[PDB]
């Protein structure tokens, strides 16, 4: 890399994107409040976008240079997360009006944060194009901040990472590695570094048991788990892993009228997306029960689906025998990646025992660390755009993989890992398709039992 | 901003830098191990560099877009610091040979980190051009990683931030703000959220008292403070705030043979830099004593200065009367920024009482949040390059300011703040010069007592 070659590559990638936007009369992205929140899902546009992010980030890194690399990173980067901590806990996104400016004086008063401290936080936020200072003394939204107005799912993602993952798990991972070594046991995690025998706490135990708090409609026991469920929905409502990508990566219409057991769990929000598009499907969403789960599940269903039976909750232990009969599809989105081999095999064997090999299939959605195949229309540099050692999808896969490590001692898998896993569960399993849309990190994989 | 206009601005800034490098037969930066670690200090080159970093970072942000902004940031960014935590605690910089590759198998064995976990950490490191994977199975250095080989000052900066500042202070700042409000009391910090009356601990108390550890030649009591001293020296040895910038921002030669009391403290490493360049100066470096400080101070002096008396340590309480007579300069680099007004005024009044107004001066070096003046040669867009709401020097100033907030409830100052402060200490104080070299965040300010 040289600064000139990176600049040349940037110009080539921008030209691809800008030419497409102009050809199709599409809005240009900006930092204004009503900027489009994403670029077109056209595969060549997304290929250019992923390369552009990587090339621009590399150019900034090269221009910073090696002398200021650690000096500046270890100074500044952690405060981007602390700024978000403040913005979420003082509800600054909602306090700044979407379409107007507000003085620091008035904003400080609205949120109860002393103005001098408020100014110091905002100074750092602006450097990430998070809010702006349109004139001295005043604050306004940017594209990035306005998208999070009135969005508890976004606030959940900030707070889960800054109040739970980073302090309890990531900061402690060196010490956990020194204490237990490299294991897949979710007890071998930061909160248990000094725990007595049998008094260890699992992440999911803390989530479902703590009652000292409240989050978005759930008060007391399990408020942290409900917030976690909110985070999962956040990754479905928009951005790279948006749930509608599944409709491009798998043809749900070929199933006709069919019963789908959705072992994705959570609140069935992906089942709802597919159900709205395919009225002949019934989704039975299976998850470990919580006192509040059936009520919240039902309250959050799209209005069109409430009371219809098309998407319904069924409490279920995923490690137990499957009670539903005549299942056409077992669907598991971003669920098996939390399961080390033995646990994943238990789940898959219960599914296989409930499958009619001639009629049934498993559809999973998970990271394939070395890349799924693009949709046939999009088919065809050593790596696919986004992958490779500085790729932005490599980087997102690594962030998710390290979250699995830090919180659970779980791990992401390559395509061969997935195939080996399924074949160990049942040697009749065959991978029929592994489709990753450009811009996403996850693949939709279709599995059948071939006799 | 549009993607096209940002790309155009990048090309203009790269052209400035590349033209200068080629004109002067200078090495091109790259990610290779022996890349130059910085660009020329020519003011127009540095102006282009600061703008290039900002424009490239803005383009990456815009191409990520608002939908993936929080989704990806709250996933990934904290793991850049966790990766550094591993790299420092397992000494991976030193274990990878500077000029050769090493297999993951061999690297894992050298450092005692299981290979599967080692691979997952390195995957994230490469995305920041920290190390690389030159062929499958193998690890090598990059420019950014090789500069930290055998550098305890760099490792100190990683570990101070990831093991002390972030967990003990930054992560707790929302709760500290809720508990005490906006104060300047260094007791009103994270470690004391649940402390009983009179049992509060100051950051500097923890640093100088904890004896459960060892760092770079200091075992037991005060090892964390010695590590902190190492971090301070790290910012002097290279990069933006390098100590030799002071020789461009102030003319130490005009003093002739002179006695300088250096209330910068620490280990006098800036006094040493100036002393080497100006043999007629004597520096009396004043700092709070520690058992190990005189020995370490003397051991780290440049060989040419050892035993010469040109740079010597004098234990001193900066809040107490000044014992040295006939002082020509009181020098304070990056010291007063840790001092709220009343404390800073105490220090400045002790200096003023020891000054002969006709002979003496104070030279300080600190952030001026709204920008010092460039050296006269470099004199002469709303903001100076690097400043403004997305400037990279604005961002560095904010990182330092928020570190002062989180650890100390201290704060950075504008030029008017500094002038007001000095005049409150002694109304005879006049600011004679405030010089900031392009690429640095700190200004060298010269103060005299005018009758
Ligand atoms: C394949 C991508 C799935 C999207 C998820 C938001 C990824 C995220 C790391 C996740 O799975 C988490 C989890 O399971 C448990 C706790 N904390 C999490 O963040
Ligand atoms: C003006 C710039 C000075 C360079 C310093 C490395 C800045 C840094 C924030 C600092 O002062 C620190 C400190 O005083 C106390 C603890 N932890 C620090 O990091």
In 3D space, the residue among A13, A15, A17, A10 whose CA is nearest the CA of residue A56 turns out to be A10
Residues in B touching A401 (Cβ below 8 Å): 120, 123
Identify whether the C-beta of residue B56 lies closer than 8 Å to the C-beta of residue B8: no
Residues in B touching A53 (Cβ below 8 Å): 60, 63-64
- Determine the atom of ligand 1 nearest the C-alpha atom of A399: 9
Phi, psi for residue A199 in degrees, rounded to 5:
-115, 10
Residues in B touching A72 (Cβ below 8 Å): 239-240, 396, 399
Whose C-alpha lies nearest to ligand 1, atom 8? A400
- Determine the atom of ligand 1 nearest the C-alpha atom of A410: 14
Residues in A touching B235 (Cβ below 8 Å): 71
* Cα distance between residue A229 and residue A285, in whole Å: 14
* Cα distance between residue A188 and residue A407, in whole Å: 9
Whose C-alpha lies nearest to ligand 2, atom 13? B404
Residues in B touching A405 (Cβ below 8 Å): 117, 120
* Cα distance between residue B40 and residue B17, in whole Å: 9
* Cα distance between residue A354 and residue A43, in whole Å: 38
Residues β-bridged to residue A102: A139
* Cα distance between residue A307 and residue A296, in whole Å: 14
Nearest to B116 among A10, A182, A235 (CB): A182
In 3D space, the residue among A194, A195, A274 whose CA is nearest the CA of residue A236 turns out to be A274
Structure tokens at B199: 């049992």
In 3D space, the residue among A300, A210, A395, A242 whose CA is nearest the CA of residue B127 turns out to be A395
Structure tokens at B306: 């050892």
Structure tokens at A232: 């999962």
* Cα distance between residue A412 and residue A422, in whole Å: 15
Among B167, B403, B409, B413, name the best residue to mutate to test ligand 2's pocket (greatest count of ligand atoms within 8 A of Cβ): B403
Sorted by sequence, the CB contacts under 8 Å of residue A242 that are 6+ apart come out as A235, A236, A440, B67
Residues in B touching A14 (Cβ below 8 Å): 3-4, 6-7
Nearest to A70 among B29, B82, B158 (CB): B158
Residue A170 CA, ligand 2 centroid: distance in Å = 24
Structure tokens at B118: 């080692």
Residues in A touching B391 (Cβ below 8 Å): 127
- Determine the atom of ligand 2 nearest the C-alpha atom of B337: 1
B-chain residue closest to A90, CA distance: B174
A341-370: string of b/e by CB count within 10 Å (b at 16+)?
bebbbebbebbbebbeeeebbbbbbbbbbe
Whether A161 sits inside 8 A of B74 (CB atoms) is yes
* Cα distance between residue A350 and residue A425, in whole Å: 10
Residue B57 CA, ligand 1 centroid: distance in Å = 26
* Cα distance between residue A272 and residue A161, in whole Å: 26
Give the distance from residue A132's alpha carbon to the nearest chain B alpha carbon, in angstroms. Answer: 7
Mutate to test the interface with A, among B1, B2, B3, B334 (most CBs of A within 10 A): B3
Whether A158 sits inside 8 A of B70 (CB atoms) is yes
Sorted by sequence, the CB contacts under 8 Å of residue B171 that are 6+ apart come out as A82, A85, A162, A166, A167, B190
State the resolution, in angstroms. 1.5
Whether A30 sits inside 8 A of B1 (CB atoms) is yes
Place of tokens 């008060």: A219
Pocket of ligand 2 (CB under 6 A): B 228, 231-232, 235, 241, 334, 337-338, 367, 400, 403, 407, 442
* Cα distance between residue A107 and residue B217, in whole Å: 49
Nearest to A29 among B65, B161, B389 (CB): B65
Rg value, chain B, Cα:
23
Phi, psi for residue B283 in degrees, rounded to 5:
-115, 120
Sorted by sequence, the CB contacts under 8 Å of residue B267 that are 6+ apart come out as B229, B232, B233, B285, B293, B296, B297, B300
Residue B168 CA, ligand 2 centroid: distance in Å = 16
Residue length, chain A? 451
Q: Can you tell me whether residue B367 is helix, strand or coil? A: strand
Structure tokens at A200: 């260890």
Give the distance from residue B245's alpha carbon to the nearest chain A alpha carbon, in angstroms. Answer: 15
Phi, psi for residue B138 in degrees, rounded to 5:
-130, 150
Place of tokens 């020995």: B295
Nearest to B128 among A56, A61, A240 (CB): A61
* Cα distance between residue A169 and residue A188, in whole Å: 10
Give the distance from residue B14's alpha carbon to the nearest chain A alpha carbon, in angstroms. Answer: 6
Neighbours of A173 (CB within 10 A): 22
Whose C-alpha lies nearest to ligand 2, atom 6? B232
Structure tokens at A59: 């150019």
- Determine the atom of ligand 1 nearest the C-alpha atom of A231: 6
* Cα distance between residue B368 and residue B85, in whole Å: 31
* Cα distance between residue A233 and residue A346, in whole Å: 26
Whether B182 sits inside 8 A of A39 (CB atoms) is no
Whether B30 sits inside 8 A of A58 (CB atoms) is no
Pocket of ligand 1 (CB under 6 A): A 228, 231-232, 235, 241, 334, 337-338, 367, 400, 403, 407, 442
Rg value, chain A, Cα:
23
Among B160, B170, B232, name the best residue to mutate to test ligand 2's pocket (greatest count of ligand atoms within 8 A of Cβ): B232
Label each residue of chain A as H, E or C. CCHHHHHHHHHHHHHHHHHHHHHCCCCCCCCCCCCCCCCCCCHHHHHHHHHHHHHHHHHHHHHHCCHHHHHHHHHHHHHHHHHHHHHHHCCHHHHCCCCCCEEHHHHHHHHCCCHHHHHHHHHHHHCCCCCECCCCCEEECCHHHHCCCCCHHHHHHHHHHHHHHHHHHHHHHHHHHHHHCCCCCCCCCHHHCCCCCCCCCCHHHHHHHCCCCEECCEECCCHHHHHHHHHHHHHHHCCCCCHHHHHHHCCHHHHCCEEEEECCCCCCHHHHHHHHHCCCEEEEEEECCCCCHHHHHHHHCCHHHCCCCCEEEEECCCCCCCCCCCCCEEEEECCHHHCCHHHHHHHHHHHHHCCCCCCCEEEEEEEECCCCECCHHHCCCCCCCCCCCCCHHHHHHHHHHHHHHHHHCCCCECHHHHHHHHHHHCCCEEEEEEECCCCCCEEEEEEEECC
Structure tokens at B242: 């390098």
Place of tokens 């992010």: A53
Residue B335 CA, ligand 2 centroid: distance in Å = 9
Q: Give the ligand whose atoms come closest to the C-alpha of residue A443.
A: 1
Identify whether the C-beta of residue B152 lies closer than 8 Å to the C-beta of residue B228: no
Mutate to test the interface with B, among A139, A213, A341, A399 (most CBs of B within 10 A): A399
Whether B82 sits inside 8 A of A171 (CB atoms) is yes
* Angle between helices A43-64 and A392-408 in degrees, nearest 10: 80
Structure tokens at A440: 């996403």
Give the distance from residue A247's alpha carbon to the nearest chain B alpha carbon, in angstroms. Answer: 19
> In terms of DSSP bridges, do strands A329-333 and A258-262 run parallel, antiparallel, or are they unpaired?
parallel
Exposed (0-12), middle (13-18) or buried (19+): which is B345, by Cβ within 10 Å? middle
């Amino acid at each position: 890399a040289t600064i000139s070659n990176l600049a040349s590559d940037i110009q080539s990638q921008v030209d691809v994107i800008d030419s497409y936007l102009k050809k199709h009369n599409l809005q240009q992205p900006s930092f204004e409040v009503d900027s489009p929140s994403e670029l077109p899902l056209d595969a060549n546009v997304q290929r250019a976008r992923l390369k552009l992010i990587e090339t621009a980030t590399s150019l900034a890194n090269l221009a910073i240079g090696s002398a200021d690399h650690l000096r500046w990173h270890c100074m500044n980067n952690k405060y981007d997360d602390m700024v978000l901590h403040f913005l979420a806990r003082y509800n600054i996104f909602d306090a700044v009006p979407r379409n107007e400016s507000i003085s620091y004086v008035e904003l400080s008063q609205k949120i109860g944060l002393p103005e001098h401290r408020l100014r110091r936080i905002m100074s750092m936020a602006y450097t990430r194009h998070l809010f702006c200072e349109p004139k001295p003394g005043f604050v306004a939204h940017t594209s990035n901040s306005a998208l999070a107005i009135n969005d508890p799912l976004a606030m959940a993602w900030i707070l889960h990472n800054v109040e739970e993952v980073q302090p309890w798990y990531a900061n402690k991972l060196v010490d956990s590695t020194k204490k237990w070594g490299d294991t897949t046991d979710p007890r071998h995690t930061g909160p248990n570094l000094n725990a007595k025998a049998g008094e260890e706490k699992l992440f999911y135990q803390i989530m479902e048991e703590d009652d000292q708090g409240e989050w978005n409609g759930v008060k007391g026991k399990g408020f942290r788990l409900w917030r976690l469920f909110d985070t999962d929905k956040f990754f479905g409502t928009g951005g790279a892993i948006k749930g509608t990508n599944m409709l491009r990566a798998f043809d749900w219409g070929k199933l006709g009228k069919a019963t789908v057991v959705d072992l994705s769990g959570i609140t069935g929000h992906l089942s709802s997306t597919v159900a709205l598009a395919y009225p002949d499907l019934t989704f039975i969403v299976q998850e470990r029960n919580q006192s509040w789960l059936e009520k919240q599940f039902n309250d959050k269903l799209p209005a069109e689906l409430k009371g219809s039976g098309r998407v319904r909750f069924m409490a279920h232990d995923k490690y137990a025998q499957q009670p539903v009969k005549d299942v056409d599809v077992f669907f598991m989105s971003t669920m098996l990646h939390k399961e080390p081999d033995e646990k994943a095999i238990t789940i898959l064997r219960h599914c296989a025992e409930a499958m009619d090999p001639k009629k049934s299939r498993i559809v999973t959605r998970d990271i394939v660390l070395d890349g799924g195949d693009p949709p046939a229309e999009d088919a065809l540099e050593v790596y696919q755009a986004g992958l490779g050692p500085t790729g932005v999808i490599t980087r997102l896969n690594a962030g998710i993989d390290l979250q699995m490590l830090a919180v659970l001692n779980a791990f992401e898998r390559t395509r061969e890992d997935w195939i080996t896993l399924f074949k160990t569960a049942d040697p009749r399993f065959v991978l029929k398709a592994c489709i990753q849309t450009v811009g996403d990190c996850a693949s939709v994989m279709e599995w059948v039992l071939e006799e």
